[PDB]
From a paper:
Type IV pili are found in many Gram-negative bacteria as well as in some Gram-positive bacteria and archaea, where they function in numerous cellular processes including adhesion, DNA transfer and virulence. Furthermore, in the metal reducing bacteria [name] and Geobacter sulfurreducens type IV pili have been implicated in extracellular electron transport (EET) pathways. Interestingly, our PilBac1 crystal structure reveals two unusual features compared to other type IVa pilins: an unusual position of the disulfide bridge and a straight α-helical section, which usually exhibits a pronounced kink.
To obtain a soluble version of PilBac1, a construct was designed that lacks the N-terminal 35 residues including the signal peptide and the transmembrane α-helix. The model obtained from S-SAD was then used as a search model in molecular replacement for this data set, and all residues were modelled into clear electron density with no apparent ambiguities. Interestingly, this sodium ion was not observed in chain A due to a slight distortion of the ion binding site compared to chain B. The backbone of Leu36 is further away from the binding site increasing the distance from 2.6 to 3.7 Å. Therefore, kink 2 is missing in PilBac1 and the α-helix in the structure of PilBac1ΔN is straight.
Residue numbers in the entry: 1 to 89
The structure:
Amino acid sequence: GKQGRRFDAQQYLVTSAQALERHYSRNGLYPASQSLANSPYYSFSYTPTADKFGFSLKAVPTNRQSDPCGTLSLDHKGVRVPATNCWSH
């Protein structure tokens, strides 16, 4: 259901963040881009900071995904948004 799909999206943000840290560990910086796979339920994006020392990963629900947590995000510090009531990963 929609809750399961939210958690699926969260899991994908996490493995995406893990890949970004592997890049960071080799290069000392985050990459200019990251290929992400969208679904009928979420659109995923990667936004590095201008200095490439930070990033924001987001999962934006489509109209087909009527979930009360809305857009989910995860940054380079592990901060998960919404901060409460939403994340289980």
